[PDB]
Amino acid sequence: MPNFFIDRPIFAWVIAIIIMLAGGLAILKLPVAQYPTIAPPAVTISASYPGADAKTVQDTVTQVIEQNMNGIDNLMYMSSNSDSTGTVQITLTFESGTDADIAQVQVQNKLQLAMPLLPQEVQQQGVSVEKSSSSFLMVVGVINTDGTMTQEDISDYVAANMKDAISRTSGVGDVQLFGSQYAMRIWMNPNELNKFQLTPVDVITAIKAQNAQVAAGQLGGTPPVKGQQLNASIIAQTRLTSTEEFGKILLKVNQDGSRVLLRDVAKIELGGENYDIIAEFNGQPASGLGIKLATGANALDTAAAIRAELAKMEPFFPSGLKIVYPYDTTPFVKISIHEVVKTLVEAIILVFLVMYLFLQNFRATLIPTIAVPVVLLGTFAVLAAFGFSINTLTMFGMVLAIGLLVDDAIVVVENVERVMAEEGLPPKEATRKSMGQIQGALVGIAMVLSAVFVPMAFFGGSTGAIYRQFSITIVSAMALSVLVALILTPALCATMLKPIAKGDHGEGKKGFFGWFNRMFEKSTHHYTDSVGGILRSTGRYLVLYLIIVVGMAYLFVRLPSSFLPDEDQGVFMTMVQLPAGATQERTQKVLNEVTHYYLTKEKNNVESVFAVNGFGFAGRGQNTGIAFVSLKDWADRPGEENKVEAITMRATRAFSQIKDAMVFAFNLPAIVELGTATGFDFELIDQAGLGHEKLTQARNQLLAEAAKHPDMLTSVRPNGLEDTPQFKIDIDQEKAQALGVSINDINTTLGAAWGGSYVNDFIDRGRVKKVYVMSEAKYRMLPDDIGDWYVRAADGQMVPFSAFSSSRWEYGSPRLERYNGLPSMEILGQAAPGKSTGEAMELMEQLASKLPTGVGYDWTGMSYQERLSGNQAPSLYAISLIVVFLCLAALYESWSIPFSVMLVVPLGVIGALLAATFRGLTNDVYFQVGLLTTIGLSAKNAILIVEFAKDLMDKEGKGLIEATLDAVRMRLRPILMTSLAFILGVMPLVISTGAGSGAQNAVGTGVMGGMVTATVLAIFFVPVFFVVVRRRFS
Amino acid sequence: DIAQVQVQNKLQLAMPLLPQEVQQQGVSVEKSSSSFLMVVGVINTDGTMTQEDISDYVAANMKDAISRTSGVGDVQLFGSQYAMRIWMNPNELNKFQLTPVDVITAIKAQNAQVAAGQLGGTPPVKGQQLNASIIAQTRLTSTEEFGKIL
Amino acid sequence: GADAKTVQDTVTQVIEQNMNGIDNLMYMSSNSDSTGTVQITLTFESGTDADIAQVQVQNKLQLAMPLLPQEVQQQGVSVEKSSSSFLMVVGVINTDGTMT
Amino acid sequence: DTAAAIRAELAKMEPFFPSGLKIVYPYDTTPFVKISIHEVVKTLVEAIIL
Amino acid sequence: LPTGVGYDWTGMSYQERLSGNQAPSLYAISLIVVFLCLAALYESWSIPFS
């Protein structure tokens, strides 16, 4: 096949042009995102039941929905939580590879069938089903500096003016508003209501009656009278549109005729739908917009379009309003992608430089410069054909495969040049001979590398997807590299190279090139002499190989395991947790302290703090909060102390002094969608209907038992809230009946006053908005205020709550959790240093096995994936080894020679492990993929050496030792000039300390160490293996 | 999947027109075979439980989990889950001048769980230090509680 | 029994807000009538799977579904694949003349 | 696969059953499927031997 | 027309505009493909040009 294209250079050029055009089209059309879809598809059902506690929401909402979640396909599991804020959130996690749209529609349809079973208030608020597996591309904050506007005003302006245009922007998959529109608010005064002998029920009824839309017909509508000439539509009562109209709503008229309008007993004002969450941006009122990218959309282009649309908005904004970007990771993504592209380009340049240094022929150096970009473009085209996208994993896969591509080009070009220099043949016949020598080896190497890299794609779950990214990328790059080396590279060698003499090795050259040449023949002679001396004492080097293997096992077992390096993305989060029962003001004070610290002590690094009072992770209440701290540009933060890790450690140390609050600063997970992968997630399930208290006791016992094992488990804590005091009101039905007051009226008055009620809608500036009736804050603060509220009995006399009710304080859960439809409690933990997560989970299972009767357990989150993919690696790599052995036996036509090639893996693995250990890195995904790349390249070198030696023994009459020595002499130069090029290409990643330095270092350090040791050891261990194997079996 | 999606898309138009009792009993749309894949029976080898108890246990502790298993298209319970059964005596109702309407109204009023709001709820007053959930009438959980309805 | 402007603001805009995130969408049209009817048509690119497009439109619509007035829910919001032309018209007459 | 998943779920449930409760399988066509497939495979092996 | 009043095409007109817009690209790509195929088959850059 190489001979076909050697005689047809134009056909090979046409093939290369086609590949380049396809790659360019793919680059133009390929989506770009930081990461692909890694986490399993998940669908979240969210409902709100205003004024309701956790138990009320769970009993009336959560349990019904969970009982009606049946018949949905590919559901891995289902969890739910009901808060004291009145919010239920149910996450259904489906198996990987499930169509998210189909799962989402099935979940919606089962909820639509369950909807009639829910409270009317829950139905009125609406139950929303979303896909929660995705994260936010961007978060655009809107702030007011003049102080004229508040959070509600800014949120309403964003909803009315900004949301639509952002949604219409190209590539904007989803837009969610951090806040709510305006809503009419009826702040009831209990004393005024008692004075006029009214109750909140009357206000609700009047508002419903006097704010509605009525269908009214048409003048002349059909069936029509015989000569009708005019047809028109009749307009009747329409919804109110202003606070003034609501003010005049009439609730009663006095005997005298003075009118008891609505404003008499309440304050009418436009406010927020919910006041639970307060937002500030550097201590200024703010609202937000979270923007999620669409499918197949370019993240960079989408961010640019969003910014352009916001700039278009800017001139029309009300004076004093400003756009800010509290959370913008797109710059980090851009820098990472640009750094990878720069790495690839510099790799090509280093290949050119090394090729010129060794061969000292410009036309020879041109050939790899044409070959490698063609393979890269073909790889892009193949990725587009498979539906992949340009992301961090794919780009680093290309970076890793660059070494294989460089080796493929260098082998062909150097072999052709060596044949020309030795036999003196002209370029065409020299190329023919070289390809006749190396083509079978190249095909066998293609098969071997396919066997090595394909199995990654068959891991299960999130790790399966992460490894499949690299697997597809590298396998496609390798296949295109081999195809190019068989099609185009020989044609380029035959057409571009110029004749070289039968004996010229360059030693006649005058300056640095001549010195380097002569030094190189001297070094090659010394290397051949050393190898020959080695082959006479093979036993010592066999025991040395055993020592190397033992050291490899030691380093592997003693190396920690990780998932993905933590990156300095320019943003981190501080979570604030106040004691139970804390109010919004105390959390606001703590958040103000945190913001002041960040903007004063860390003023050089931090540019903005987005404080969110009322919402924090693993909670939703007044006693929780979260601040999203954004750092200045990496170029403005030079040093190791000005990075996210150091900043977070300093902030945590400073905040540990804060009293009456737990404040903890931390960096983002590498993949926020998967969240943390640090430890284990454990679910303790109530299986026998024990109750909340018994489950709490079981959880406490398990936590104590885990704490009694410091050396195996660390920071085993509950991922939930503890029980808190609650105000219980016991309404005596007998007393209420005796005094002539209905229980329904009492409950309605209490709920409307102290929790608020949603009555109906109105039209504000041509937008439908909600109407809420609630007590004024002054009269719904303390238990004593219960005495300020009166209910009208059937007799028309107002009776107090104390007359027909009593009060006390009890304990209740502010957040109730369920797993797979049963009550549960979530425990988060992690293995102690030096302990694997598997044995930590085994110990947790052993501890849980001793818990009281009726208490079960389950694994969720990352633990579920770990259980799924626990045993895949050994079997997959056993299959890989078997297939590699079979391919090598096919290549060499021998059942024993393949062992000489396969004995080379430890040579690179040991160096990779040593490099990782010395730099204090972990066994993460990047390290493993780099390990596979190093193993593949070392196997390539060994395969070529053994092929040359065997061909020398068979086609010629040379003996074992002579053939091996000649083979190593022939293969020394390509090995060295590939290792040097790849090592120098990866050095920038090794020494990188800027943005994205985590993944860069993880990819670079292991690769560099593995290449160094693979080269150095293999160049004189492979001949030993070949000689020993040939002697043993022959 | 698409067939079920379209069928229930059309069914959602009829749902508002169906009687409230039908909606409250739960309308189901399913895609499954006409024949049972299998039958998982449950007995008691000690003889302590009756048919009602076994059926309630299967409905409450095993039915939902099986229904959520992938590949399960339908689950038919050979029994029924427990429920609070009020067996009315017409003679007693007439003696006290009562009607099943009155019984239903009393059950609805005195067996309910109401959202009662919060102490120190947002918007709060300045200087508010306490925030708590107000608990009120809760659903009854025993036959004794139901028998005490006035 | 709703005006064209009122139904457009209360219904048409609300629905149209959440329909901009659907895949393979070429363009969108909508008409609001004084009879209270709202008709929105989303035209997708050629070769798009119609069933998947309809499923995605349902998924986006259910988000805005609660925001519509209770009367809209009572009558119901329908999402279905549509065509703008009649394949044929089948008329029925009474030759005798005994049926109006 | 569905039968295997159902049996796995029942195994999860079983440890928490009340005293005396027992699961039985009064109707299951799956064992016939397994035995039939096994018999055909056995026939193939015996055919190779013959 | 006054400022703020734009226009667009729909239905048949959208398809007609798209076809007219993408015709020249189609011609160029087809010519390039034929040229490359001729060069590949006849092993020359002169025969495809002629």
Ligand SMILES: O[C@H](COc1ccc(Cl)c(Cl)c1)CN1CCC(Nc2nccc(C(F)(F)F)n2)CC1
């Ligand atoms: O995951 C979502 C977004 O969380 C964030 C938020 C900010 C950043 Cl910068 C980032 Cl990165 C992430 C969670 N989210 C929390 C509250 C929000 N509801 C709200 N309501 C009123 C005001 C606000 C606030 F504070 F965001 F303006 N939010 C709705 C759901």
